[PDB]
User: Fold probable epoxide hydrolase from Pseudomonas aeruginosa pao1.
Amino acid sequence: TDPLLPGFDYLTLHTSAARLRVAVKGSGPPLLLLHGYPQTHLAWHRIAPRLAEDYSVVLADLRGYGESRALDGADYSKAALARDQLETMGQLGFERFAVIGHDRGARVGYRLALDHPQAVAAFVSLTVVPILDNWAAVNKVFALNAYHWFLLAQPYDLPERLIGADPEHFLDYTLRRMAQGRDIYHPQALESYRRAFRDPAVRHAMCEDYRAAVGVDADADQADRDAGRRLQCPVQVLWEERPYAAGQHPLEIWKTWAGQVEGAAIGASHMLPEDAPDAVLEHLLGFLASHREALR
Amino acid sequence: TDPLLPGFDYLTLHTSAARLRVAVKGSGPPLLLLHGYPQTHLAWHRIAPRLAEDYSVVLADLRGYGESRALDGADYSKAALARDQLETMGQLGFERFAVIGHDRGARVGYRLALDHPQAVAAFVSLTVVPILDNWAAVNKVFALNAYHWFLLAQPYDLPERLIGADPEHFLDYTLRRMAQGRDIYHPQALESYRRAFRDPAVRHAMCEDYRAAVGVDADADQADRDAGRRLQCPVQVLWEERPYAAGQHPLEIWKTWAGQVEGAAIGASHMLPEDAPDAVLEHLLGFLASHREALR
Ligand SMILES: [Cl-]
Ligand SMILES: [Cl-]
Assistant:
């Protein structure tokens, strides 16, 4: 078995509003990789090493997730976490960079691209469309499948009380569900996800993410829609192979948010980074190579 | 302060599939009153005594709620609980009777009326429309406000684990939310609701109710819709005074399910039995008096 993140240098960055866990490797154009829920930067362990052969790779734990913490009533909106990313990359020497996000990290990523277009050279979303589009699609089956979007958004401290009683049960159930029962979690990465979820501050930060998704994040998306503001960089979307209702296909949705869009279906679960790393890498590498001028 | 349910005779009925807590009082035409979630028959304490001055009144705990238990993988569908009601009333000497339900009890009630029209002389729904109509209305705000409809319907034993860790916290939060913070719960009725919710079997039965609502109960409603089957008796619906979207007004919805429908708005919370008993009584008494021939 290969080790986890060979040659990555683990850092703690001190920013205006947060203490952020960052891991870096490589040389060349900069890429920032942003995990999702209920995970940490280790979700990238099957992808980041290959990328670091050709690029400067930065992995971060999102504010409140993993080992990253707000300095503190902290703001856990996507806009705030986007500012964390600008500050992170700037501290490391990068004023403009590509962003590759999965799940909540893709939500941070597109909000960064909309708010700070000068900073984002290219954007890749794994599984995600803007939250405004998600909310428009809510129906019975949406709400059953994604029940946690509604639970975790309830007022403080309802969901924290429910998910906090036996955190590892809930974490493990959630990861199994998201993976469709597939054996995709490296046992050591799993212990890291578990440790983070056992921290009440992490669980709270996750609920705040979901609260923001209902409220300020959706309001920000609507304001950009109203203004006709689009992402300015090339966009790639890689989506789970599953049926999409009319108007809900991720490629169609991204074309309403960006003028330069491509993508592909991947035959895996929602957990693309861990479940289908080779497929993801093929697509990522091709995209970054085809837009090599954009990265300059 | 008045006592709770003066003169009511507390019984335990043994049926084919259940052991049911029943309380009875009065003389005259029979009325069956069915509580909802997360309560027991005591929810009727401000209404049942007045009714018993003029009617035969039967209060029951729904299967799995309160002190009622399945004999047992029991069926907690509305159709099963409707059969419990037929057996209950039959054991007490009534083959045909009026049904007054609140919340989940109204769902039992209309399913009883559709399945067994010969048994139901008149039907009153407090706050409820058929589940088929509820599911058609699901959108973002529905799912946020009624998040528990989606949580409690998740597969066994996810919600049981979450709500079971600190049952009284969840019970108390839920009752306060449903009452819009209004001080409507008699402290002794409250202890009864709390005791029931502290029983894991009760919590499980409540989740099974919500699971059935998604599945078999909705399928039953669709089959009646497909067949053009309507309730055959007079119907009254009393609803919470709040805005209803087009097509969602309870009076309009019930007119699609029944040819003889009336109703009124009540300026109280969802918890009509406890929050607005005098208003409810005025309407109930008028309805039962105007349909006195139907009761014969
Ligand atoms: Cl997401
Ligand atoms: Cl209900």
Chain B has one domain: 1-296. The pocket of chloride ion (ligand 1) is lined by residues A 36, 103-104, 128 (CB under 6 Å). The longest helix of chain B spans residues 78-92.
